[PDB]
Amino acid sequence: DEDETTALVCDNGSGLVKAGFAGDDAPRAVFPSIVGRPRHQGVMVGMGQKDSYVGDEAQSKRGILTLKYPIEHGIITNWDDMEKIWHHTFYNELRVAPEEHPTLLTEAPLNPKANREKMTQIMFETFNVPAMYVAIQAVLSLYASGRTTGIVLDSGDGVTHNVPIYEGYALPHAIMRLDLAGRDLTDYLMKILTERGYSFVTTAEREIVRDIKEKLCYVALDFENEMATAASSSSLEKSYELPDGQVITIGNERFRCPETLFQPSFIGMESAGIHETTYNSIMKCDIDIRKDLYANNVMSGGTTMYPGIADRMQKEITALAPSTMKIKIIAPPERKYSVWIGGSILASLSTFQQMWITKQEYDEAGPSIVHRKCF
Amino acid sequence: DEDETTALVCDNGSGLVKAGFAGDDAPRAVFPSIVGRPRHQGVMVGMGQKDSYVGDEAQSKRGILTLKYPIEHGIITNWDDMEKIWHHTFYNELRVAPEEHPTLLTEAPLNPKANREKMTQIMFETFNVPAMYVAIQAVLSLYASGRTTGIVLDSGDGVTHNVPIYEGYALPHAIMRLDLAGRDLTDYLMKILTERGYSFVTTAEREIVRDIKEKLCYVALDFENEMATAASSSSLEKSYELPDGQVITIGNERFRCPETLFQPSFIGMESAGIHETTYNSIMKCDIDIRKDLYANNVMSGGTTMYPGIADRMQKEITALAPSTMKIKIIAPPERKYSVWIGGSILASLSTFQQMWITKQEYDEAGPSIVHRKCF
Amino acid sequence: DEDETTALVCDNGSGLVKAGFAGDDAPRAVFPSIVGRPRHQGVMVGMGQKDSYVGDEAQSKRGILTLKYPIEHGIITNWDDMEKIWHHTFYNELRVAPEEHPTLLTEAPLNPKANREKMTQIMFETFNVPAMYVAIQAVLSLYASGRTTGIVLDSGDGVTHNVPIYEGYALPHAIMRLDLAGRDLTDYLMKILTERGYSFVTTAEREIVRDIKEKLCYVALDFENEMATAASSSSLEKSYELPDGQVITIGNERFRCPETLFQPSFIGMESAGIHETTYNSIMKCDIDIRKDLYANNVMSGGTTMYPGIADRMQKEITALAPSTMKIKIIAPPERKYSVWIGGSILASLSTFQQMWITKQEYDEAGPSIVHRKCF
Amino acid sequence: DEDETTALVCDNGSGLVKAGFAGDDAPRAVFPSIVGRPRHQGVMVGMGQKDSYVGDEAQSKRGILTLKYPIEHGIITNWDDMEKIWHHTFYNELRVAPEEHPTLLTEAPLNPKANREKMTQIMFETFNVPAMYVAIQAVLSLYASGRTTGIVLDSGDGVTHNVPIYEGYALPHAIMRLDLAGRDLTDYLMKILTERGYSFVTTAEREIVRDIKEKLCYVALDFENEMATAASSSSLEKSYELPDGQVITIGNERFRCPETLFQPSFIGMESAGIHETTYNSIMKCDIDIRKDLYANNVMSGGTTMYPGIADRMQKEITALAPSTMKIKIIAPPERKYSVWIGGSILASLSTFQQMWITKQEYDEAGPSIVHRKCF
Amino acid sequence: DEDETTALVCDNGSGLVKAGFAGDDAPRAVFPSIVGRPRHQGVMVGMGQKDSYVGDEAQSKRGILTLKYPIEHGIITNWDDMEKIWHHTFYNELRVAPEEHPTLLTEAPLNPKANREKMTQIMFETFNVPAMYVAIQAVLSLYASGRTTGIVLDSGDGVTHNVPIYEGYALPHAIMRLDLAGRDLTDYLMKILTERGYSFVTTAEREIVRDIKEKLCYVALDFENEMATAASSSSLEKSYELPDGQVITIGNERFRCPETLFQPSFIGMESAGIHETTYNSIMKCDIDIRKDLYANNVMSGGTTMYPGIADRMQKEITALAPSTMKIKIIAPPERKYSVWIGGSILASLSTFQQMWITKQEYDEAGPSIVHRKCF
């Protein structure tokens, strides 16, 4: 730094802009991926001294704002804020120039192809960065576990992926991405608060909804059996005092939202459970490889941190998995910051310098340079 | 070794690469002739530590690989892999230099003229081997036994040979070759199983078919009498559990594939079984040899070790053979390494040392040294 | 009929249930072979008229039904409906008694051996028909075309066969069958639409996928060469309006799924396309057979009605064919019902009166009569 | 004819049933001596309309058949077809009744004595023929040259003969027959295709092998000297494009198979060269007769039509022949049809009517009438 | 021997090397004159144990050999091997040096002038032999019979002799030699089986033929009457189970082959009968010599031992010989060693030692010392 290239590590995901420096094991800046916009209206004389709201600063105020989500479904809908997000990352959190170091940002797999170019364009040309790489999300989570073969089950905010990866980067398989992760479960809960009685309509309390979900809603081994227990619950029934005033009694609700993740039928969707994809991708592969795919079940992303998520994959997996192989869940103590931890690993590499896309490359090999390095 | 020339004893055949040192008593290194290649696909950051997997290292994996077979019919299909094989044999499976040992390899009788030269060349030019000879397959099973005359029914893995042998070795007027050994039987077993109800499409589980064959498909004493027992299947069936959650009950199939051995008509092949050729080759031989050819029916190679295999040649041969000579089937308890063990004995003789072709001789007489020394 | 024995001709395969009578030029009753099942749910006042939908009746509505396919892989996956399908054939769509006429059905090559009997047993024992035979799929397609010698590339409606045929009918050997089919392709198109930007899921729109395939998706002469022309689409992009209200611009898609037929490598499957097998099967054959196989490339089945596929076989076939024999495609003008037409010819011969199984033989000799006649 | 006896001329040899009429110089029917048998198997509806295959009709199809050889080694193994051969000759080629004319067939010298009777038996008694004679093969070839003393060297398909004949029919000498002619050379070539690399196993391509031999494989003056020339051949090395697809490179092979005829050591036999028999038979005869035996070296039969066969007998003969006599090869422009040309000569004789065996004679002088006229 | 000079007694003839010492009663060492040479070829590490198999050692094995003959027609055809034949006879069976013992050999009457000297030369010059006499062959059977005068019909194996012998030394006026004995009979049996339906031409199995002749083949009483007995078959045909399971029914052949002895006419020889020459030589002699010549028709040599041979000469002789005297066949019990016994006698008298030629006498009067005593 100031004479060494030394990159950053940015996991500009759809849930947290997990930024931090190269070779670190903690992301310095962690702040949401919601950009805020007013709705309070009125006159002014004094003001909040802002009018453009970004990350944690956006989050701060919710009572005066409607919280827009720049990245939905791994597609960045609004690019105008993205320079300013990254200006909030480099200048205003990490306290660095875009010029001093590259920037490793994340690509959510099977991304819309125009975004890959569009992003770089904002960086190099408009925000002068010496280099950058838009890595493949899921792959970074493999390296985080220290695994080098397995089935990476990354359920981050916006997208879930069942990615079988081999020692050397895999050839197209049933490597897949699906929207069914954390945001979606946030949107399901609100459905179910509609038939409850408690009111939660807008963006501003939707984030509060996402909070009520994360820290309580344990993953039932089977919904139906804990459903019957709901009748004379004692440990299923507790009140989650809303931390700004209200009691939010949650009975059946607690293991109703987590079960939805693996059974999209509770929404009224036809999508496959994430444990179905697990079977599909592993069975497809040669008989002698299934043993190691089922041995190494990597489960990263914050969504796979609900209480009792671990014991859920012990029956779900054994269902449509044979008796000819060991079945063992890999779930590292922390796993929310999983794509960011992996990029840090790459940045400790000097080959990643030459596996990243240079400033000069953009002008020298046209815009298609992007897809030339990310394949 | 390390003090004397002391060769290798190598059975570079199409079934097992039976490697070892000369003067050794067993092939220390023994591993099938399979070259592995990827098909993991997906996201790789790890590495299987090869791309062109070979031998035992390939054999480990089956679920990540596709299995090529480099010597088919005792004919080296691709010599480029043979080069990678020997680089794995000498250096990494025997942990010796070839710039030290001579090498005894095997030749399936009556091969292409080129194989003999192609083999010698890779040895002298690409391993600087002090000397080597690629002795003639079937003949060696004769030296193993201590026998000096007989009819060698070497059924290796792609090739069957009816070599009536004498100490002044038989001329090409009695010796015969026909493709009908072990690999050819494997692709029939699955054939008749496709209509059963199990699937053997990919290569890696074709190998599994080869396993099922050896340790459960016994040779029918009379196909027709065991066919009739099929009405009351009980002794017929017996499940071979395959650990991917399946059970493989095999009925008439257990003895159906072995009768194909003796009747190529079920293949669609118009050729004669192994018990017919026996007659042909003795009837070609001189009258004053035929009683002892029948005394000395040597039945070698790993294919001729299925349960009940030997006893079929006690009734079939005797069928259209005379009743005027003592029929004794010579089928030792072990005849897998019949060629390998015989190849040790010759590699412990010093006249076989002067019978084999030195490094320098190859420059003195070209590639053609082979056919100048051996025929 | 009712005054003549007049059999049926039924192509009870993976296509439609093509029924009609012996010596008919068309299958008068034609309705598919998908079976429909309810899923309307809730309070119900009337009824959907039918409980289980069969044939055409099922195909009609899909928005109230979830669509089973009782026959997948040429393996009858559910027998219970087959009974109503033949009841739907004779009684309500041709309005005859099964006891009036015999029945000619199809057997796809290397069917499971129980399926052959199972079918017969419900027909003869549970519906009674004076006689019936389950003829061999491909062989009928030869006589339909009018040839008597060639390479029949009968790609029926779920199952592909490369049958080199002669005046005598080929023995198991270079007659092969493979699952690699239109219905399999259907699941490859929906696959690629994920982040590309379209959505297809359920059963009811899987059938629409099959539609999008047939009438717009033509096979590239070489994918890679029309792929690059994609760069600016003009001859690629066209719109397929889908009823629901939504436009389906298809660029590369037109020839991307169709190439996958000839190239299961893009699926992720190790298997070889059907034109590789065409070479394989011909090199397997004896040389006094090969000149007429390339000379008369008979291209049968509903898969060779795909647009730009015949022209695909002018370069695919000619590629690894000797220039020592003429090569010329025999393409019939229509060949979807090639197996039905050919079976009609057989049901219009009297030699067939003795080539079929009479009702009474089934009770008289145990169910192995099936395999006694169609071996 | 229809009032004149007028015989046929039939050379029912082991290579061609050379039939034609009396006094002709062309055999009308010439067609092989191979009777065909199926091996294609299968079902049938249409068929080839035959199931018994005979001569050229047999030859036609090879891809559906295995070609049996009724006459091997001048011994007719299958008599069942022989009526049908002769029915294919008289009725179906020459277009005559067996009753209208006699039939002159050939006896290969030193024939198994039961065959002479066995043949007549089929004719007179079962196929009513007014007369017949089974002439002595070699003798007919003498008359063809117009010679009346010499040494007849008939190398037809199955048997070679060195027959010294005097003006009047000879008294037993070293008049001999040997199997070493054309068929045998066909069987040697296949040996040598085994060590080449090209595959030719069965009956069906063996006839093709016989073709590759006849029209290319020139007779070396000395093998060994043209062997050295093989190194940088230009006129020795040419490719015999197989006329149904393949190139068949033939180098050393060309003058390797023809040299075998005179040197049985290349097989691995101990038999005498045909030029050794020449010395033996001539030297044995009185000193004053050798001059005319060596003057008239008659070389008939198709086998003695390879290119450079003529110049071969100019050194071979002079080797062990003195300086006291002229040495001159008699080899008529055509000489394949040599036994048939000679019988035509006999049939222009009216003494041959009385030197043939009458219908009536068989019943009137028992079966031994046969050996009474042929001595 | 080691106590007296004691010669050998050798009746060095074509049918056996009848060897022994002087003073013995029978030849100990008896073995046919066959020299073996390899013929199976090939490469080797084992061996046939000789490469110039000779005598008893050659006769044991035959299946790996081609059999040279060194004395034919009682003319020693080759001397090169004869030396080696004696090197196995003297050294290795008689177990003594020829550098240490004299030698009684045989002279077949009327040998060419070199033969008498050539034999003797290898014994004096190369074996150094102390003394030797090569007595005259036929004469010895005379002394063996007890006779002093008579007509010796000495028929060993190569040479038949009609020797009238005087009390002393007869003169040439009726002594004759004709080559027509045993070995000729052998080539006629294999001859007459070829038209019958068998082959046994080659040397290795010719010896077997020779075995069949001697212990089976009996001379008829007259060909013509047992030729008429041929009508019935019961007394003709009888299977000669030849070890190898080859059953050989032979009818007229047992007594068809022996007649050839008395009749060269079936060979095609214009030479007359050996039984004709007997009369001729006695009709040449004076009347005061014939009465006792007919009293003494001495019949010696192993050819004169077929059952039915002797008794035939009571009808043959009396046919064209007078009835005024006693025709008595002196037919000894056994007469295979007939020449060996006569030499044993002579070699048991010391005056024959003194009638024989010492070593030094060879140098002292050159090679012509031979014809000086034994002319």
Ligand SMILES: Nc1ncnc2c1ncn2[C@@H]1O[C@H](COP(=O)(O)OP(=O)(O)O)[C@@H](O)[C@H]1O
């Ligand atoms: N401890 C937790 N238990 C279960 N779900 C959680 C937990 N932590 C985070 N999540 C959920 O996962 C989503 C946040 O994912 P995040 O890692 O920020 O996303 P991205 O990888 O898209 O940047 C949120 O919906 C949140 O509720």
Ligand SMILES: Nc1ncnc2c1ncn2[C@@H]1O[C@H](COP(=O)(O)OP(=O)(O)O)[C@@H](O)[C@H]1O
């Ligand atoms: N019991 C058995 N009968 C038959 N095949 C067997 C048996 N046991 C092992 N085999 C297998 O069959 C094949 C025999 O071929 P092998 O003799 O090793 O061949 P090559 O001479 O071609 O190297 C081997 O692959 C071996 O593992």
Ligand SMILES: Nc1ncnc2c1ncn2[C@@H]1O[C@H](COP(=O)(O)OP(=O)(O)O)[C@@H](O)[C@H]1O
């Ligand atoms: N003219 C056509 N071109 C392409 N496909 C067509 C055509 N006509 C009908 N189809 C539809 O597409 C499929 C044709 O191929 P299909 O018969 O399914 O073959 P396969 O044996 O490979 O499954 C059928 O499902 C059919 O309904």
Ligand SMILES: Nc1ncnc2c1ncn2[C@@H]1O[C@H](COP(=O)(O)OP(=O)(O)O)[C@@H](O)[C@H]1O
């Ligand atoms: N032109 C030729 N040159 C050399 N060999 C030939 C030629 N013509 C025929 N032959 C060979 O001679 C044999 C055919 O002999 P053929 O006259 O038909 O027999 P037969 O007299 O037994 O009826 C075949 O092996 C064939 O290859």
Ligand SMILES: Nc1ncnc2c1ncn2[C@@H]1O[C@H](COP(=O)(O)OP(=O)(O)O)[C@@H](O)[C@H]1O
């Ligand atoms: N006991 C026998 N009966 C009939 N033939 C015999 C008998 N023994 C020998 N012969 C035959 O007579 C010939 C052998 O004569 P032999 O005395 O050995 O000859 P030579 O005096 O030339 O050495 C052989 O052909 C043999 O088959």
